Structure formats: structure tokens, C-alpha cells
Design a protein around this ligand. Sequence first.
Ligand code: C3S
Lengths: 8, 245
Amino acid sequence: TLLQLLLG
Amino acid sequence: YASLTEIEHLVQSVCKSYRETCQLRLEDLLRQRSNIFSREEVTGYQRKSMWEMWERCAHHLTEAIQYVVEFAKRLSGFMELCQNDQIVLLKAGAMEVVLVRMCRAYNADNRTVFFEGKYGGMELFRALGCSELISSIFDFSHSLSALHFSEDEIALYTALVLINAHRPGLQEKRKVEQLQYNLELAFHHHLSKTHRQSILAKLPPKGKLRSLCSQHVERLQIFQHLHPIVVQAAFPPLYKELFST
Ligand SMILES: CC(C)CCC[C@@H](C)[C@H]1CC[C@H]2[C@@H]3CC=C4C[C@@H](OS(=O)(=O)O)CC[C@]4(C)[C@H]3CC[C@]12C
């Protein structure tokens, strides 16, 4: 998900 | 069992994370107080199509959320939690932090918020077609302005807004409880030093922030059902991930 991506 | 030095370090670490992840300088916000939307400019916003206004607002809201994600990333202990629990806290808490952070952009004297360059009342947002939610948000910000928060206080408060062990679906709930408690210690420590513990009893009930967020999700449902293509084509994908059912 996008939240995962923004957190690395 | 965080020592007094650990707590003092946690205070400074939280307030630094916050200073570095604010989209707007507090000096600019007070400088632009006299800068208020005219009667002609308000009418222009009110005569925008629903889809356009929603699209604009969703973009600006997503932008603020990107800053909240950055705040979380620099927040002492947040990255120490497991991946799943980071997601859960951010997904539930991102909008809540923005709604709190809003009081920096809110003028109590004329009941206006800083939006797209100038200050305007809740009348600006009438084309959204969710006036109960908008006025609810303006009421919430008005109640926070009565508390006269300083930057450090908002920093410590928003940290507690984000790190909330009651969020459903937490895989390692106890680790979240420990960090939450330490941030409570950090919060109470700073307040007592400044003789400001009296605001704690005046803090909004935790169910009020949930209610505003529930209200936002519902108003998106109403809009997304009437305009499904707009959301799919134009809305920031993060906004859709966080708020769409
Ligand atoms: C329909 C749905 C989108 C309702 C939300 C409409 C309003 C209430 C939103 C849209 C755009 C939002 C702003 C976006 C961006 C910011 C900057 C942020 O600055 S910062 O320094 O705190 O990071 C403070 C909150 C603030 C002013 C938000 C308040 C809240 C805000 C006006």
C-alpha cells in the first residue's frame, strides 16, 4: 500500500 | 522505565520533529491575518462545481497528511513499532493530527482559516455540500484556540493523538501502550514546567476526533457515489487509500 511505500 | 533524562530528551525530540514537519510557518500565518477573502472571492468559491472544490480540498488535505507522515517518521519510537502498527496508527491518526494542526491556521477573532493564500470563513466550503462537517471542523478548531496552545504543546499533543493504543487491529498493542505512556510522561513533564497542566482537563474528549473522522469518511461516500470517476481520475491516491470505502 501507499502508506507502506511512504514509510519504507 | 524511562528516566527523567530520557523524558526530557523525548520532549525535545518531539518538539523538533514537529518544527521540521509543519507545512506553514506560524510567523506567516499571523502576518496574513489581515489578508481575508473578499465578498467577490467567496462567491467564486461558492460557485465552483462540487467536483472541483472537493478535488482542490482533497489535494490540500493530502499535502498536509504527507507532512503528518513525515512527523511520524521522525517521531521518537514510532519507527521502532512493527510495520503493521505504523500503518494502523497513521491510517487512523493522520486526519486527526491535521484537524489539530489546523488551529495554527485558524483565527478565532473572525472565525476564518488560512486556505489557498488567504483567510476565509466556513462559507468558502459550501460547494462541497457538507456544511455540517465543515462547521463541525470550524467548531473544533475554535475550541482548540481557547486553549491557547504553544508550538511545543501542539507537538506533544499531536504525538499523543497519533500514538493511541486503543486503535483496533494493533498486532503489538503492549509496545504501543509503553510508548504512549512515555509520551504522556513527556507531555505532563513539559506542561508542569510551564505551569500549564490546567489544559489537560480542557482537552477534547478522544471520541470527538473519531467523530470528525467518521463524518469525513461518510461525506466522501456521499460524494464518491455521486462522482465515482472524479475520485478515480483526479483525487490523490493516498486520499483514496486513507478515506474511501
Ligand atoms: C471535504 C473534505 C476535504 C473536508 C476538509 C475541508 C477543509 C476543512 C480542509 C481542506 C484543506 C485543509 C488544510 C490543508 C493544509 C493545512 C496546512 C497545515 O499547516 S501545518 O503547518 O500545520 O502543517 C494546517 C492544516 C491546514 C490549514 C488544513 C486544514 C483543513 C483544510 C482547510
